[PDB]
Amino acid sequence: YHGDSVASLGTQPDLGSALYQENYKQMKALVNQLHERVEHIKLGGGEKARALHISRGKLLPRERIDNLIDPGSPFLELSQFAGYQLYDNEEVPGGGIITGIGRVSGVECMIIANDATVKGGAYYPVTVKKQLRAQEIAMQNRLPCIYLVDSGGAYLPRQADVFPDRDHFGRTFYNQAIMSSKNIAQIAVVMGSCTAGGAYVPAMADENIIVRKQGTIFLAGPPLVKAATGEEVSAEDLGGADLHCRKSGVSDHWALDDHHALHLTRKVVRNLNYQKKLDVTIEPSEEPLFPADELYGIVGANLKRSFDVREVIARIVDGSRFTEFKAFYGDTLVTGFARIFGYPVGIVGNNGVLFSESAKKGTHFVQLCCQRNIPLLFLQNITGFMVGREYEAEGIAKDGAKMVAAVACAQVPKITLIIGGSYGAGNYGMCGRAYSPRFLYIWPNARISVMGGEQAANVLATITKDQRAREGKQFSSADEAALKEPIIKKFEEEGNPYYSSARVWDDGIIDPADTRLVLGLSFSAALNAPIEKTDFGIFRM
Amino acid sequence: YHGDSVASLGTQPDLGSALYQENYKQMKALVNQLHERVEHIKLGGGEKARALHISRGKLLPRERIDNLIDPGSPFLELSQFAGYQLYDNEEVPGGGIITGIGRVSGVECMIIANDATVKGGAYYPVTVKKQLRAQEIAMQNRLPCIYLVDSGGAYLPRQADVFPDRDHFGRTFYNQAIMSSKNIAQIAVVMGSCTAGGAYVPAMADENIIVRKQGTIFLAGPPLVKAATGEEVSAEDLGGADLHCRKSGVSDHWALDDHHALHLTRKVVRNLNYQKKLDVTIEPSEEPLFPADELYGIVGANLKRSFDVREVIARIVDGSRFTEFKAFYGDTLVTGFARIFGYPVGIVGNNGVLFSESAKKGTHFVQLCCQRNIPLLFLQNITGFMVGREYEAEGIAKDGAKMVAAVACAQVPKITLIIGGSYGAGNYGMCGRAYSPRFLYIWPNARISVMGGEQAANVLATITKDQRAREGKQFSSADEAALKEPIIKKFEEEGNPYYSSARVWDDGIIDPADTRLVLGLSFSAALNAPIEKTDFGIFRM
Amino acid sequence: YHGDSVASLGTQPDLGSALYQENYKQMKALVNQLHERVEHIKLGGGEKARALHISRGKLLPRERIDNLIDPGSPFLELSQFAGYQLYDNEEVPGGGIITGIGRVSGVECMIIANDATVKGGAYYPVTVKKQLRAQEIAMQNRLPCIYLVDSGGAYLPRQADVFPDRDHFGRTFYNQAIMSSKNIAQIAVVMGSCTAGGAYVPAMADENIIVRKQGTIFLAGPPLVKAATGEEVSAEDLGGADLHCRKSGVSDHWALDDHHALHLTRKVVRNLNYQKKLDVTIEPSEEPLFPADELYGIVGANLKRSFDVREVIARIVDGSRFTEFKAFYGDTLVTGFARIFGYPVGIVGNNGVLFSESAKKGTHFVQLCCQRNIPLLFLQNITGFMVGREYEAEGIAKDGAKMVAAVACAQVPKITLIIGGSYGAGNYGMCGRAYSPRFLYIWPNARISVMGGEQAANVLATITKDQRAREGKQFSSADEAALKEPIIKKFEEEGNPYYSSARVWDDGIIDPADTRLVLGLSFSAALNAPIEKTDFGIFRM
Amino acid sequence: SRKAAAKESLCQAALGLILKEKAMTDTFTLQAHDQFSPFSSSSGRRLNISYTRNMTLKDGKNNVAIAVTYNHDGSYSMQIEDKTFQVLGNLYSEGDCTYLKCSVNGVASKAKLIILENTIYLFSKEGSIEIDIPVPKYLSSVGPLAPMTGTIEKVFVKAGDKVKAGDSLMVMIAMKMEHTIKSPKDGTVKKVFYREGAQANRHTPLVEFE
Numbered sequence A, B, C: 001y002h003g004d005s006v007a008s009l010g011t012q013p014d015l016g017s018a019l020y021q022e023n024y025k026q027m028k029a030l031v032n033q034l035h036e037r038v039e040h041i042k043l044g045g046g047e048k049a050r051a052l053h054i055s056r057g058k059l060l061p062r063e064r065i066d067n068l069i070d071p072g073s074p075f076l077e078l079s080q081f082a083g084y085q086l087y088d089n090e091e092v093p094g095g096g097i098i099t100g101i102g103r104v105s106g107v108e109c110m111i112i113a114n115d116a117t118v119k120g121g122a123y124y125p126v127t128v129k130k131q132l133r134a135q136e137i138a139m140q141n142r143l144p145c146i147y148l149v150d151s152g153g154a155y156l157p158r159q160a161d162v163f164p165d166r167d168h169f170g171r172t173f174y175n176q177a178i179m180s181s182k183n184i185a186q187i188a189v190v191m192g193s194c195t196a197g198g199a200y201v202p203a204m205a206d207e208n209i210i211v212r213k214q215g216t217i218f219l220a221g222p223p224l225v226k227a228a229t230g231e232e233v234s235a236e237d238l239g240g241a242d243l244h245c246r247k248s249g250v251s252d253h254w255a256l257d258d259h260h261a262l263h264l265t266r267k268v269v270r271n272l273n274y275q276k277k278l279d280v281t282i283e284p285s286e287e288p289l290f291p292a293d294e295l296y297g298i299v300g301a302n303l304k305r306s307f308d309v310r311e312v313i314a315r316i317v318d319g320s321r322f323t324e325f326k327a328f329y330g331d332t333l334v335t336g337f338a339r340i341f342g343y344p345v346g347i348v349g350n351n352g353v354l355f356s357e358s359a360k361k362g363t364h365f366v367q368l369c370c371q372r373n374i375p376l377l378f379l380q381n382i383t384g385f386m387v388g389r390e391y392e393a394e395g396i397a398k399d400g401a402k403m404v405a406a407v408a409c410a411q412v413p414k415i416t417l418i419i420g421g422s423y424g425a426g427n428y429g430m431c432g433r434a435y436s437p438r439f440l441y442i443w444p445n446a447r448i449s450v451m452g453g454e455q456a457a458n459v460l461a462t463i464t465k466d467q468r469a470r471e472g473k474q475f476s477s478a479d480e481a482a483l484k485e486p487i488i489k490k491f492e493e494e495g496n497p498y499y500s501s502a503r504v505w506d507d508g509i510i511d512p513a514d515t516r517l518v519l520g521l522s523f524s525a526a527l528n529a530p531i532e533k534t535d536f537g538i539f540r541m
Numbered sequence D: 001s002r003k004a005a006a007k008e009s010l011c012q013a014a015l016g017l018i019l020k021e022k023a024m025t026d027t028f029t030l031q032a033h034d035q036f037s038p039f040s041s042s043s044g045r046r047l048n049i050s051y052t053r054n055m056t057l058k059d060g061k062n063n064v065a066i067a068v069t070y071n072h073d074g075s076y077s078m079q080i081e082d083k084t085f086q087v088l089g090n091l092y093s094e095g096d097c098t099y100l101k102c103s104v105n106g107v108a109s110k111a112k113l114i115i116l117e118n119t120i121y122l123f124s125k126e127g128s129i130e131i132d133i134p135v136p137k138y139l140s141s142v143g144p145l146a147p148m149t150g151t152i153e154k155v156f157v158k159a160g161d162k163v164k165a166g167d168s169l170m171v172m173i174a175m176k177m178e179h180t181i182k183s184p185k186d187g188t189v190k191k192v193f194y195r196e197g198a199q200a201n202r203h204t205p206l207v208e209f210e
């Protein structure tokens, strides 16, 4: 029927209060700084390497992505801040690679482009990490991969951190062999010079495109056969497009230049015989009833000052409609049912510390969502897990483990958004990075550590006073200042959003307006795989 | 019928030749050094911490493991060298944890013991890595986990490297929630003091044992509630055995002391209703026809000097019987069918560089083994992948990708043993660490890098001469000496066996005699899971 | 998106060249002769038997088929040339039976009509063969069978060739019992006189229609009970419609005359509760850019003179669009992706002899098509398999077996069209009759033998010279002429299209224009069954 | 004679093309199962950055590059040579004709939009302008060796002959057919390497020219 009226969330804030104005100014400053940093990352390796890249007749890699995807279609780029201030004097913009979810020939694909302007397409350790994260996104969501290979091989003085381990360079080819065994298409466009580790990327792909007189594939290049076997060969007749396309048979399609390679790639994606079938129910999409710079006014940048998570849900969901679940029992967790772009979402949001009743409310909700096949969105703003004595007497760590066990075992698409702090085992109760969410974005005011600093400094000091009390002497003000300096400094440095996305601990720092769009994009990509039945472990009652 | 006679491998070596005597002396020196290093690792944190550990009435952790497993039963300990010279001035023996496959109540289990004598049971990053490796062994092979928890929580100074990422501390509880959802039993014996990250280990386990007046479980300890909430509590009444066993209900069994906890654990394992069922064919086991210190004489320590891998197969398999497959086509790869302790094994061994015919021979063999459900043993001794021009003209990187794609897609138990070098993409063709073997042991003469040293120095020098030739000047002898020093030094340092097992890049450095026993142990553990049908990707013909 | 422009195949031929004009005249002569032969086959047993058939008030069988199918709907008739000059002085038009795929009540059905004007509906051996081929088409494609039974029983002096074997008359009832066990509906309309082997056809069917005072079912007729038991009975009260419809219960519906039987049959098909569901992707159909009498000009009738298969693909596919796969490697095989009537087709066409690279290209393509569930169309124009010494040194018979093994194991709908010669094991590499294609049509210029006449005569002569050389004498010109006469004559006689479709070695000789329509009809019928996952054997690399 | 298009007219042509591509996207979506979903809106919304599309339109004989920035509010900023235009608009239908509604720097206009193969037609009350879309090379592009180990039938040329392209050079019969070697080359045959009746081998040289 769906004609009967309901109520909506959200209230209009006081635009003149000094709290709102200060919060708006702080979050506007954070978002402007985020914008200028990513505009510097957008250039890549500087204008010298871009000039020498277009002097050989190639496109720049973002031009390749713009010409590959559908015209006017959005592009969800993942981990734009990988490698940011990570290596000591080396600048690696974007990680040295560009991964994203786009729309090619009406199919949502994962696109992995070697940005060859930075270090000649060398593979730093964060490059391997960011590429492996893109590949596990594409295997989880069942998205075809398009690799735009312009590589340079594995860096040498970091070779340990690139070569042998489980989640090191060789995993890449493992992920190609397994995805193609599940009918997840791999397409490689060779636009560069694949030297001996990159050379396995087109040879492990179902269909190749290589560019005339520009793309080269060899298991051992000219200086490599020089140092290994002692031989001089020219590169374009050692591994050029003519040899591979006509004699050896490594390549399947042959392109004149980069525009022809991208046109052929769109043809290849169209001949994949793929049709997206949905299993959730869809309703007409509707925009909310409130703007999204109000989120700048509401959230701010002060993590010691709490707010209400219902204001955020009011500004990201369809029509600001929200069916709340158990609204009075355990009210530091907000659970409910909403819709984003017509998709049904179960939302779990933090509003305080986690008590025992909040964790039981969350476990009941996650079982409900897995029984009905409804995707989950976690909105992390955590400070702790209620330390105390009357709390451990009840079973608080008996109740947060049920929350952890239900979030781990859940087989629906889960997406996390960290809108505030995220500390301790609370981070595990609300689907942190270890619990395999499909995506995990953060806002520019977030913090994530094992504690908050003050607490770590206090625990270390009291633990070392206890420890030294086998003999026992104090250095009171000296120990205080000399432990409260380098621990607060370290925890505030490593809790930053740029510190955590300089590694690949999340999928991006996003602007609080763009939030709604980004969730919709992620949720539609996450619906390419059919939702499987959930089996839970043993709930410890 | 099985009565008709066959032939066997192996020849008796010249015990008087100077090659044999020098090789025997070198490999004996390596094995004696391995023995004395692991005997120093066996003590743990020194005799001071052991005295203060037994002054509180606890056992030492190796005593706990000896009293838990069946009497006289062997114990396969994994990664005894984790953390060896890994952190700069901190000594972390054994990683700070003891993992192994043992036999408890007639069931082969995985045992994970917190060695509390080192750093009070603190979790270093290699401790998290080694524990996660043990847990993925137990999930792959379907082995029950017994955690002997005596923790100390995260580490703090290196909290970033322990906390947020995907394969960081929180993954531990993920692996408990998923294994218990597959009916793989978790048992936790709380013998120590689980502080806020360790406190989730018994609460995520199906059955607990906690020790009277010794084991404590709390989500926030006394200095932690001091720094977080500001409260003084006593520890044994904040989280002791009486509160959890009688009021909160976190614990299920209650032990008087450590011997009672281990006796109760053997009871709990016996009530698991588990019966091991085999699906392979078994024959009567038989010892080989040659000794195993001959392997010291044959292998040696010189990696520039090649040997025959059929001498090794002659000394590890049943009766030295070996049915060779395609013995004359691609004879730098030795494939065949043997038996170890009555189990059928398909063996793939390196005897030289990988040509194209060797890779095709290996792909045919791996398809044969997956069709028949025969486990695989890879014996890596690699130097390369045949760099050349007439080789890339044929499709060498078209043929090594078939080997890689078949080894990746294979769903039988695979075990790797690195008996020599292991360089380059050859490492991926022969089931390196990235290709999920069940186990991966190394011999004390092995080397593993992205390529030998010399080659990396030569490639870097020739590419920087090419690079600088846009303007172009030479520093010939200076550049030569100053690049041939710190690159050969780095590659020989990082290629060491102790460097690679100081991380968790493998499951152990083993003595070449013990090889046969260790393979048998690993293979029987790997047969606890039923072998699934293999689906391959697209073979690029 | 599907808006971006692409290129198309085909070039306009020289309408004035003597090659085109001669080719057009030859293929026009072949097609006119095909038309006049099938118009003579259309009459059946002559005007005497047709007059005596309509004197009893029955329709002719093609009238029955026209009144049964949907009005204006096309009819795909199978094997119109069965029995053509096959028996020595007996003329059996059409085989004595009419099989075809039609459209009844909006459902595509298989219709099997006993043409009772020829030999009183007797079952010759080619009649049993043609009927069994129709039934295996209906079991493969999951089409309901409608039998219009007007039989006469199994011929007597050919009784061996009709009775005992596996693929002899009794298989018919086997195919009814198995199809009806898979929910493939059988409907029998008894319009004639089913004598003791035909009497099992309505009794094995789910629903019957029998005609008042015209249809009779008995396990032993009046002369048969005369010769067996010695009894005189009248036929219409031994087995007429009243006894079976009212007392014995063999019949389910009762018809007044043939129009009532066909109207009731359309009702019965409408109550089948069948709904056709597609699993491939469909696009808007589009006609090609070139005519189809150009195919007369391009192909001709000279099999020694080669042409390009891309000219044929240009004239049968949607918009003449074709995405070629590996166009420069192994260019005597043309593989690619096209569309016919909106259905995705992978096309494999011959352009020369089969080398090793062509067979590897074909194996890669067939794996690609089975991974994506794309139907296959093989266009056979074969002369051989590249005999030579440097070819057997590589492994040519190692590479054609991969092509054979991939075509055999493939579980997508395969359709073959023989547009030229088809000789040797090349015939098996390109999905001959033994490899279960759904359909197999031929053009009137085709040839199919084990080799090519000249080759067989030469091999026989040289092997008998070798054979007699144990003693050794020659009969040079005599042996030459006397072996080159009766071997070229035999091979050219048995290689004819009418020789091969006089048996049921194919599904029809078709006109090269009608080709496009016929493929579309066959492909839509072949989509009534859901495509199953393909398992391959062991690829011998 | 034909006059050059104004920069505002090139903005209208670029906008009509972009909106036509959107229309194709919309009619694809109407046939999709995944309806109402994002990616269907041709908004060009990149994460944290803007998207600029570089297209080239051919005005008569000369090419002009137009850099189209996708703005968050649905407007376009089109920079042609140096000058930036604020370009907004949409499509609407009246009967069987499609019209393009434009606003360029606050100046509203309306023109009929017809796009036929490559040519963009804009019919307004001030004239009619034809702007062409350039066609990329890969849509407009469309000595000897012995193929198989076979016996030679006939040699057509001698040492010292002059031939043309597409001319019969040698004939060989291989197993079952008839493959004539024909010349793509130009120059003079100095060399007939194989005598008549001999057995040539695959990938081999038959005729050499100096």
Ligand SMILES: CC(=O)SCCNC(=O)CCNC(=O)[C@H](O)C(C)(C)COP(=O)(O)OP(=O)(O)OC[C@H]1O[C@@H](n2cnc3c(N)ncnc32)[C@H](O)[C@@H]1OP(=O)(O)O
Pocket (backbone or CB within 6 Å): A119, A120, A121, A122, A151, A152, A153, A154, A155, A156, A193, A195, A196, A197, A221, A223, A224, B450, B451, B459, B460, B463, B464, B467
């Ligand atoms: C052997 C291995 O598998 S590991 C490394 C791969 N093997 C190699 O061939 C290493 C040598 N480099 C190459 O692979 C290739 O020759 C390429 C890609 C570097 C050639 O790239 P070009 O387009 O010629 O640019 P160039 O070679 O100048 O490289 C640019 C810069 O990146 C560096 N670089 C490029 N590839 C690598 C690499 N694989 N390892 C280390 N540094 C590299 C170069 O030192 C150079 O230095 P600079 O940035 O300080 O000027």
Ligand SMILES: CC(=O)SCCNC(=O)CCNC(=O)[C@H](O)C(C)(C)COP(=O)(O)OP(=O)(O)OC[C@H]1O[C@@H](n2cnc3c(N)ncnc32)[C@H](O)[C@@H]1OP(=O)(O)O
Pocket (backbone or CB within 6 Å): A450, A459, A463, A467, B119, B120, B121, B122, B151, B152, B153, B154, B155, B156, B157, B193, B195, B196, B197, B221, B223, B224
């Ligand atoms: C950090 C978290 O997320 S939870 C942990 C927070 N709180 C704590 O664990 C502090 C107190 N807890 C302890 O470690 C306790 O000492 C126990 C009970 C677990 C271990 O038994 P104790 O008898 O206390 O051992 P003790 O504290 O003397 O251990 C001494 C060493 O352990 C180290 N240590 C123990 N736990 C930790 C930890 N979580 N982080 C860093 N270091 C630690 C200390 O640095 C100390 O160093 P030292 O070798 O210079 O003395």
Ligand SMILES: CC(=O)SCCNC(=O)CCNC(=O)[C@H](O)C(C)(C)COP(=O)(O)OP(=O)(O)OC[C@H]1O[C@@H](n2cnc3c(N)ncnc32)[C@H](O)[C@@H]1OP(=O)(O)O
Pocket (backbone or CB within 6 Å): C119, C120, C121, C122, C151, C152, C153, C154, C155, C156, C157, C193, C195, C196, C197, C221, C223, C224
């Ligand atoms: C035993 C078995 O396996 S099947 C044998 C069945 N036994 C019989 O003899 C039944 C045959 N009798 C009949 O029912 C009728 O012949 C019919 C209905 C089949 C034919 O219709 P009618 O209008 O009677 O035509 P009729 O049978 O008189 O003659 C038609 C021709 O078919 C032939 N014919 C019919 N059945 C058979 C048969 N089973 N074997 C050989 N010839 C046959 C007749 O000899 C006659 O041959 P002709 O062309 O030389 O004249």
Ligand SMILES: *C(=O)CCCC[C@@H]1SC[C@@H]2NC(=O)N[C@@H]21
Pocket (backbone or CB within 6 Å): A382, A383, A384, A385, A386, A387, A422, A423, A424, A425, A426, A450, A451, A452, A455, B196, B197, B219, B220, B224, B228
């Ligand atoms: C900052 O996050 C405040 C202190 C952290 C709370 C501590 S850390 C470990 C314990 N686990 C938990 O959920 N809370 C406790």
Ligand SMILES: *C(=O)CCCC[C@@H]1SC[C@@H]2NC(=O)N[C@@H]21
Pocket (backbone or CB within 6 Å): A196, A197, A219, A220, A224, A228, B382, B383, B384, B385, B386, B387, B422, B423, B424, B425, B426, B450, B451, B452, B455
């Ligand atoms: C030491 O291992 C010798 C040189 C390494 C061989 C190189 S490294 C990268 C290429 N891949 C491969 O398999 N061999 C080549």
Ligand SMILES: *C(=O)CCCC[C@@H]1SC[C@@H]2NC(=O)N[C@@H]21
Pocket (backbone or CB within 6 Å): C382, C383, C384, C385, C386, C387, C422, C423, C424, C425, C426, C450, C451, C452, C455, D175, D176
């Ligand atoms: C006519 O078809 C020419 C000769 C046939 C080729 C022979 S016949 C048997 C061998 N198999 C094959 O594929 N080619 C050889």
